[PDB]
């Protein structure tokens, strides 16, 4: 069958999503982040390894540049669960969502320029580096971030 499944984010499992993000990413988000993601439904899932929360993906919709883009705010799982196909599962999930309506031009995200393993993961699914924004992070080094975009339309 399957021992890696995805599941919803509800107000009952929100602190678990938040804990995960604290461990996985070197930036901290305040609770605006976690309030907004309660409203996007399918654009935010938790990843389970047998009812243990191991990672999550959280998205947001940007209407700008006359484009409707999907923005991946966070996608990740705890270190010992990497290279298991969990991130692919979550990415494929956001991709599966973008192509159930067809109203999307692109999907994009930010990746720190030192994070070579995230760069390799996204470029594998057809995200290209379109822009390198300098001093995008405030509190961490290196501060520069690539803009990885995948095209749909």
């Amino acid at each position: 069958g399957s021992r890696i499944e995805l599941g919803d984010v509800t107000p009952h499992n929100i602190k678990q999503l938040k804990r995960l993000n604290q461990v996985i990413f070197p930036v901290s988000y305040n609770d605006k982040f976690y309030k907004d993601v309660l409203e996007v439904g399918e654009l935010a899932k938790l990843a389970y390894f047998n009812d243990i929360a191991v990672g999550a993906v959280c998205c947001r919709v940007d209407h700008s540049q006359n484009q409707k883009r999907l923005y991946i705010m966070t996608l990740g799982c705890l270190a010992p669960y990497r290279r298991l196909g969990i991130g692919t599962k979550m990415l494929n999930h956001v991709l599966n969502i973008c192509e159930k309506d067809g109203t999307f031009d692109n999907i994009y995200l930010h990746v720190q320029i030192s994070n070579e393993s995230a760069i390799d993961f996204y470029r594998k699914f057809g995200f290209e580096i379109i822009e390198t924004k300098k001093n995008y992070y405030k509190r961490i080094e290196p501060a520069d971030a690539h803009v990885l975009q995948k095209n749909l339309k």
Binding site: F25, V27, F33, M73, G76, H110, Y136, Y137, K138, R139
Partner: peptide, 4 residues
């Protein structure tokens, strides 16, 4: 990974 989003800003800051």
């Amino acid at each position: 990974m989003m800003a800051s």
